[PDB]
Design a protein around this ligand. Structure first.
Ligand SMILES: CSC[C@H]1O[C@@H](n2cnc3c(N)ncnc32)[C@H](O)[C@@H]1O
Ligand SMILES: CSC[C@H]1O[C@@H](n2cnc3c(N)ncnc32)[C@H](O)[C@@H]1O
Ligand code: SF4
Ligand code: SF4
Ligand SMILES: [Cl-]
Lengths: 330, 329
């Protein structure tokens, strides 16, 4: 009852023992790191392995610790994300850490919020993927047509903050997102221009995303207005394997120099305000790393941080009506 | 400029090597010069510059793993190289301080009146000042000795390697530079008088000024850690700081003393990354030895060196306190 997520310890331990691993790395996103010692203690009690907890941030499957842990561990257990189509330097076991939730209490609330629509797309992220089939079957049992988008690199019904490909060609009347966060509903909204609803399986509240979307876009507009006065730019690259986009960074550099501005590529692992402070000549920054940084963290930075698409608006190459979130595609 | 950035030589080196992409690595105090240097390199060579934005604390902290495949050459400022196997070819630039030390020579001599045999000690960025200081003291009746070690040049130390000052037998040690850590280590290893000249602001400080407050802090942290029942052992993935063998030995030792211990690996260590390990009462740092000593004020829970843990477990007497060192990599 106390476990908010299924950490699948039984499976993790059986696989550790069968693999014969003697040193095992653990990676957790921010919301799961509090469980690291409990899980490490269980693994060490039931296997001959020594656990190495990765204390570094872990923002997604773009951010596996295989480069840093190469030579230190035989196996990495990575929680919270499904794997990206990358080749990892160290054997890695991905545990979804599914939400411990019964959504049956909310099915009737969802049906009433959907009374005006026949054709419904269901979307969520990794830790609620296990709920989609129950919701889909309920809706279909109540006269609805339910579609789950897929892609070459995302599971049925799944989006990532940098990959909305699976919701782009669905032709639904309404998109129901499962989750408390607003960034994924924002991208579904902007790409589909269709109604987007979102169920918080904890609040049991269903919300419309249109209001949050306009609030974010007003902020993006104000940041872009400031960036139009920029003369010298930083282009931010991350060395994180799934985030690394040096080809794009060099393309952006040439574009800025073609527009008679200075531009300098800066590469870091974790991006934060403190690492940008020394470069006092730079007026604004374009992020070639995680597409969510410029949108979700912008209030932490004094100077404007922009996506490449937003840089296109600065340069009058993209119009506001075609505002678009950044994505990473493999 | 405050430091000789040796720009003409870096540019000469880039062109001869034919580098198309060049990485730049700076410690904190030099990062603000990154844009001017990138601008000059890109103006005078065909290369594109990548500024390493990550924190950089020493030669232990080269970005050759992160930059691997991105750059043909790395220019690294402010440090002398460590005996590591650098993946990407690297060019180390000392970044010597742009200081004229003449104004402080008589003041140094005045503070050294009681002594005949004087050791001079400094770090990379002030090594170029030592000859002028040494020659002045010798013109004024002093015997001046400079220590050396296999990897550290004449008169130089680092925060994890004090071997060059352990066999000098001087009456007093004059450290050139800011900060308390290096003079604290000289004092602890020699138990001799140690004076420190900060060449930027010309202040000369004695032992109590850089050692008393810190030793009392360490003693208090040790006392608090005697109550700890569950431990974290911090390892760094940074090539020059990696001590996993030691970390695993410390884990086994703590388990022999009927306590729990968990190895946590991180790149950069900071208070925020220890907040989720709420069950842990104390930490032992098996990474850069300066972390536990210099940054203790940032962490609520005790962060100890391995030698301080020895004191907690009653395997080392407090009187035999010893700073941590990385002797082998
Ligand atoms: C919730 S996962 C997305 C968030 O993770 C954080 N994030 C992702 N990648 C990075 C990075 N390379 N550096 C710092 N923060 C990141 C940003 O805050 C982003 O909004
Ligand atoms: C001035 S170089 C020594 C300083 O660098 C910092 N430092 C060295 N290694 C690390 C690390 N792995 N993580 C965070 N800070 C470090 C510590 O603050 C120390 O006081
Ligand atoms: S949105 Fe950012 S953190 Fe999430 S998978 Fe994509 S790049 Fe990684
Ligand atoms: S003292 Fe620490 S920062 Fe300086 S070289 Fe040694 S390990 Fe690196
Ligand atoms: Cl690329």
């Amino acid at each position: 009852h106390m476990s908010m997520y299924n950490m699948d310890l039984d499976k993790v331990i059986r696989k550790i023992n069968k693999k014969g691993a003697r040193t095992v790395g653990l990676q957790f996103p921010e919301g799961l790191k509090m469980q690291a010692v409990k899980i490490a203690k269980a693994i060490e009690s039931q296997t001959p392995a020594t656990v190495i907890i990765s204390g570094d941030p872990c923002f997604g499957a773009c951010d596996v610790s295989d480069y840093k842990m190469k030579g230190s561990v035989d196996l990495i257990v990575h929680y919270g994300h499904t794997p990206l189509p990358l080749k990892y330097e160290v054997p890695t076991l991905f545990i979804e850490a599914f939400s411990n939730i019964d959504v049956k209490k909310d099915l009737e609330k969802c049906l009433e919020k959907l009374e005006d629509y026949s054709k419904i797309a269901l979307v969520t992220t990794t830790q609620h993927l296990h709920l989609l089939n129950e919701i889909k079957d309920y809706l279909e049992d109540n006269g609805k047509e339910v579609v789950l988008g897929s892609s070459k690199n995302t599971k049925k019904g799944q989006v990532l903050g940098c990959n909305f490909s699976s919701i782009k060609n669905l032709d639904a009347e309404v998109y129901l997102f499962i989750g408390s966060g607003n960034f994924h509903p924002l991208g579904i909204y902007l790409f589909t221009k269709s109604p987007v609803l979102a169920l918080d399986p904890y609040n049991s509240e269903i919300r419309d995303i249109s209001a949050f979307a306009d609030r974010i876009l007003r902020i993006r507009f104000a940041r872009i207005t400031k960036a139009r006065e920029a003369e010298k730019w930083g282009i931010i690259v991350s060395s994180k394997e799934g985030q690394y986009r040096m080809k794009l960074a060099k393309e952006i550099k040439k574009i800025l120099e073609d527009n008679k501005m200075e531009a300098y590529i800066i590469m870091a692992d974790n991006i934060n305000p403190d690492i940008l402070l020394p470069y006092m000549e730079l007026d604004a920054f374009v992020v070639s790393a995680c597409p969510r940084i410029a949108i979700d963290d912008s209030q932490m930075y004094k100077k404007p941080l922009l996506t490449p698409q937003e840089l296109e608006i600065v340069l009058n190459k993209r119009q506001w009506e075609n505002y678009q979130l950044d994505e990473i595609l493999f």
